[PDB]
Amino acid sequence: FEDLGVGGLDKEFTKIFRRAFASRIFPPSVIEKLGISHVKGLLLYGPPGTGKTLIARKIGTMLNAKEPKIVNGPEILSKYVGSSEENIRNLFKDAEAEYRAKGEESSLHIIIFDELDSVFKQRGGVGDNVVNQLLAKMDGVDQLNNILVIGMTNRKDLIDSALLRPGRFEVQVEIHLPDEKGRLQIFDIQTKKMRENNMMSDDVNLAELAALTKNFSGAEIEGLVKSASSFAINKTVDIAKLKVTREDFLNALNDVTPAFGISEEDLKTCVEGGMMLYSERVNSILKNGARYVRQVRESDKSRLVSLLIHGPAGSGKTALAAEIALKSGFPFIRLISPNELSGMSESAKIAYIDNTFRDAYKSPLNILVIDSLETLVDWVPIGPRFSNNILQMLKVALKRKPPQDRRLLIMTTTSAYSVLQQMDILSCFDNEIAVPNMTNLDELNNVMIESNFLDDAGRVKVINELSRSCPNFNVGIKKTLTNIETARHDEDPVNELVELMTQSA
Amino acid sequence: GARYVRQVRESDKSRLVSLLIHGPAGSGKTALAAEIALKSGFPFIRLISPNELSGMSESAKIAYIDNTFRDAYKSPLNILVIDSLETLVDWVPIGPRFSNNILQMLKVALKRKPPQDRRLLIMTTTSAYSVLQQMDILSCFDNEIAVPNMTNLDELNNVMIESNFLDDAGRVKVINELSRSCPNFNVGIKKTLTNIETARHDEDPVNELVELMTQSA
Amino acid sequence: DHTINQVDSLHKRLLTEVNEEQASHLRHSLDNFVAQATDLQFKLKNEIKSAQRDGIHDTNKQAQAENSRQRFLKLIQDYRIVDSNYKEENKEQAKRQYMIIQPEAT
Ligand SMILES: Nc1ncnc2c1ncn2[C@@H]1O[C@H](COP(=O)(O)OP(=O)(O)OP(=O)(O)O)[C@@H](O)[C@H]1O
Ligand SMILES: Nc1ncnc2c1ncn2[C@@H]1O[C@H](COP(=O)(O)OP(=O)(O)OP(=O)(O)O)[C@@H](O)[C@H]1O
Ligand SMILES: Nc1ncnc2c1ncn2[C@@H]1O[C@H](COP(=O)(O)OP(=O)(O)O)[C@@H](O)[C@H]1O
Incomplete structure (x- = not known):
């Protein structure tokens, strides 16, 4: 199983071997004395980029089958009546011919469908005819038992109910993400040319590298290694000893971004302005958050x-x-905000949201943030108006438990608490944090010292003037910072800063 | 419910x-x-929930439901459960807005007798009885069971001991404290379990649970 | 306590406010008072827990802590009451508006 190039997939090969090939290995005399047919279909499903094509291809090679004939879903269709399904009929011709000619001694053929859930939807247009054709051919009046058809898909829950019956697609399998052992083995397989041919240094410890990379998809590790080797060779240009060191590995690991991992760059942009503790609240809030993280x-x-x-x-x-x-330190971190969704059609919005939620359930451990609610929901007070369907998408989503032991935390923020009361949605939420704005002068003092607005004289005088002038200061941090910058880049701090602070409160 | 099962x-x-x-x-x-x-032991049992009806379009919802009902008829004995009617229909109170088609389809479906002496039982659940009165759909149902909240401390003690959370002094302390801290007590079981579990981790003693139970009622 | 009573006053006023701009102003002031209420709740939570811990060996300190506890519990009860009443009232208004023939179709 592992002698060939597939790492981490152990149980799957036992399962598939026991069901598929235990009836094609022994001499025909025994099995005909047993009088059972052969399985004529296989559905294996899972997230993209995990190695489905690879295993499918290798299966043919172990059985010494004919070369695989391959097709992908959406290309089947055409726009002339009766041409869109003729293609689905072409693929079985050669098999029919060889079966009729030779008989029971023919050589096994193999077929690969890709993205089966593009075309074969539940029936009841071209689509019904396509499905009908496939049914009528895959098992019809005439016996044809020298074939195997393989299916790869992402969403098992839309294929028509009839293709999944014992007789067409018998064996259903899942391919999941690699574990640690998977990643280590993947490294072992991948660096065979480098190892035997002796262009890998002795310092690199691949076990550490496997320990360092989480939620890597099993394809991209190839990208990592080839990039590291390219890095080393390009660094060289000398033919003394072309060695790849841990340096190149670290560089490449730093460079790449996994698909199912932290999306750091957005979150960094979110907090571009810096976190300064101008008061006591900030500490308390952060402590609350850490507590809940531990609880999760x-x-x-x-x-x-x-x-x-x-x-x-x-x-x-x-x-x-x-x-x-x-x-x-969680591995999986994504952010949903209006900036992405802008410009899309409504159907596109709901689709994006659904997919984004569906992604997280696969990873062991996840945190997911939502930027704002009224904005997404199209609220506008006069009338009022809003898009309902999006509201329902969120409302149902916020109660789904993860399908399995995987774990999720979901965080969200809003400015219109009361409005959420009024729509009657608040029952979804467990715990609440409050974030009030500044109502003090010493707070303003702390922020000016952190921003280093000016020398002490200006600072003292302005706090004095606002003490004697504004008694009930109350403004948010946004206007504070932008106003401070405006005064800085402008002239004469009392002339504007004091006035603007008064006018804003 | 057992009586109903036998009767059908x-x-x-x-x-x-x-x-x-x-x-x-x-x-x-x-x-x-x-x-x-x-x-x-009814051989055919299948479930409809908003969980499965996630992110499709309206017509697809209709098609799905219709298929499920159709499938039920081809078997001698059947049971179906419908979750959160008033949420399959997307009721929201400001307007109020809701989809009409799905409501009408269910109104029809709940009355159609199966063919050829085949046997069917239907359960459905809701939490907004009033709006159901208001939409004038209640004619379809032959009977109505009612489920209230828990409303006494002894029951809550039963819940603790089934959870095995309590200690022997702990139960006395918490029960007495709440006995004088809350004259009226009424909560759902779900929230109660949530609270017991969050209280089991940090500061196990009676405190956190007492004020949490307060913060529920 | 003062903040809770202000919240109750805004609740009563928002039930009667018909000018959309004033209602919006009431909603935002409500958001400010709710946020302040939650923050005071969290602060008192930690400070009272620390005071009860500090009073374990002095019966007078324990007494003080327990008095604080009682008063804070009363505060919580008041909050609960207010909230419940307001919910019940919002229900009757939401009944009022739509239980009648409606403006001409969309
Ligand atoms: N203690 C602080 N906490 C949060 N933000 C702070 C703090 N001190 C300064 N800021 C500034 O606040 C900004 C980050 O907050 P952010 O822009 O998300 O505000 P917001 O309230 O979500 O905005 P919006 O008005 O769009 O709803 C940055 O400019 C950051 O520097
Ligand atoms: N005897 C019991 N009766 C009810 N719930 C119980 C019981 N024992 C344990 N539970 C727990 O409490 C939960 C009850 O709440 P459930 O999940 O049924 O929500 P619900 O109130 O029907 O839903 P909704 O939130 O839509 O109103 C059970 O799912 C289970 O986790
Ligand atoms: N478990 C695995 N074992 C070996 N190679 C893998 C594995 N997962 C991914 N790969 C590598 O990634 C590629 C597999 O392609 P795949 O993930 O099936 O993409 P697609 O699904 O788009 O065909 C090959 O280069 C393969 O060697």
């Missing part, structure tokens, strides 16, 4: 937690959620 | 029966429905 990681029964942070506009709410996330 | 299994005329479980949110209706179902 350690429990067994609390596989999901819904946490809301809410407060007045401009109070700086989203950044705290970011900071909590980036200080956690 | 053996009655020449009574081919179709429809029940309705209603109660306050978090009272835990779906659990009861599932338990009734599992202990019947």
Whole structure:
């Protein structure tokens, strides 16, 4: 099983071998004395980029089958009546011919469908005819038992009910992401040319590298290794000893971005302005977040937690959620915000949201952030108006438990708590954090010292003037920072800064 | 429920029966429905929930439901459960907006007798009895069980001991404290379990649980 | 306590406010008072827990802690009551508006 180039997939080969090939290995005399047919179909499903094509191809080679004939879903269709399904009929011709001629001694053929869930939807247009054709041919009046057809797909739950019956697609299999052992073995297989041919240094310990890479898909490791080797060779240009060291590996590992991993760059952009503790609250909030993170990681029964942070506009709410996330160390981190969704059609919006949620269930451990609710929901007060379907998508999503032991935390923020009361959605949420704005002068002092607005004289005088002038200061941090910059790049701090602070509060 | 099961299994005329479980949110209706179902041995059992009806288009929802009903008829004995009617229809109170077609289809479906003496039982659940009155759909149901909340401390003690959370002094302390801290007590079981579990981790002593139970009622 | 009573006052006022701009202002002020209420709740939570821990060996300190506890519990009860009442009232208004023939079709 492992003598060939596939790492981490152990049980699957036992299963497939026992069901598929135990009836094609022994001499025909025994099996005909047993009088059973052969399995004529195989459906293996899972997330993309995990190695489905590879295993499918290798299966043919072990049985000494004919060369595989290959097709992908959407290319089947045409626009002339009766041409879109003729192609599905072409693929079985040669098999029919050889069966009729030779008989029971023919050589096994293999067929590969790709993206089966593009065309073969539940029936009841061209689509029904396509499905009907495939049914009528895959098992018809005439016996034809020297063939095997292989199917690869991502979503098993839309294929028509009739293809999955004992007789057409008997064996259904799942391919999941590699574990640690999988990653180590993958490295072992991949670096065989480099090992035997002696262009890999002795310092690199691939076990550490496997330990360092989480949720890597099994394809991209190839990308990593080839990039590292390219890095080393390009660095050379000398033919003394072309060795690849851990340096190149570290460089390449740093460079690549996995698909099912942290999306650091957005979250970094979110908090571009810096986190300074201008008061006592910030510490408390961050502590709360850390507590909940621990609760998620350690429990067994609390596989999901819904946490809301809410407060007045401009109070700086989203950044705290970011900071909590980036200080956690979870592998899987994605962010949904209006910026992405802008310009799309409604169907596209709902599709994106659905896919994004569906992604997380596969990984062991996940945190997922939502940027704002009223904005996504198209709220506008006059009338009022909003898109309902999106609201329902979120409402149902916020109650789904992960299908299995995998774990999820979901964080979200809003400015219109009361409005959420009024729509009657609040029952989904467990715990709430409040983020009020500044109402003090010493806070303003702390922020000016952190920003280093000016020398002490200006600072003292302005705090004095605002003390004597504004008694009930109350403004968010947004206007504070932007106003401070405006005064800095402008002239005469009292002339504007004091006035603008008064006018804003 | 057991009586209903027996009655449907053996009655020449009574081919179709429809029940309705209603109660306050978090009272835990779906659990009861599932338990009734599992202990019947009816060969065909299948479930509809908003969970499965996620992210499709309206027509697809109709098609799915229609297929499921159609499938049910080709078997001698059948049971179906419908989760959170008022949510299959996407009710929201400001307007109010909701989809009409799905409501009408269910209104029809719940009354159609199966063919050839085949036998069917239907359960459905809801948490918004009032709006159901208001939409004038209640004619379809032959009977209605009611599920209230828990409302006494002894029951809560029973819950602790089934959870094995309590210690012997702990139960006395918490029970007495809440006995004087809360005259009226009424919560759903779901929230109670959540609270017991979150209290089991940090600061196990009676404190955190007492004020949490307060913060529920 | 003062903040809770202000929340109750805004609840009563928002039930009667018909000018859309004023209602929006009431909603935002409500958001400010709710946020302040939650923050005070969290602060008192930690400070009272620390005071009860500090009073373990002095019956007078314990007494003080327990008094704080009682008062905070009363505060919580008041909050609960207010919330429940407001929910019940929002239900009757949401009944009022739509239980009648409606403006001409969309
Ligand atoms: N203690 C702080 N907490 C949060 N943000 C802070 C803090 N101090 C300064 N900021 C600034 O606040 C901004 C981050 O908050 P963010 O822009 O997400 O605000 P917001 O309230 O989500 O905004 P919006 O008004 O769009 O709803 C950055 O400019 C950051 O530097
Ligand atoms: N005897 C019991 N009755 C009800 N629930 C129980 C019981 N024992 C344990 N439970 C737990 O409490 C849960 C009850 O809540 P459930 O999940 O049924 O929600 P619900 O109130 O029906 O739903 P909704 O939130 O839609 O109103 C059960 O799922 C189970 O986890
Ligand atoms: N478990 C694995 N074992 C060996 N190679 C793998 C594995 N997973 C991915 N690969 C590598 O990635 C590629 C597999 O392609 P695949 O993941 O099936 O992409 P697609 O699904 O788009 O065909 C090959 O280069 C293969 O060697």
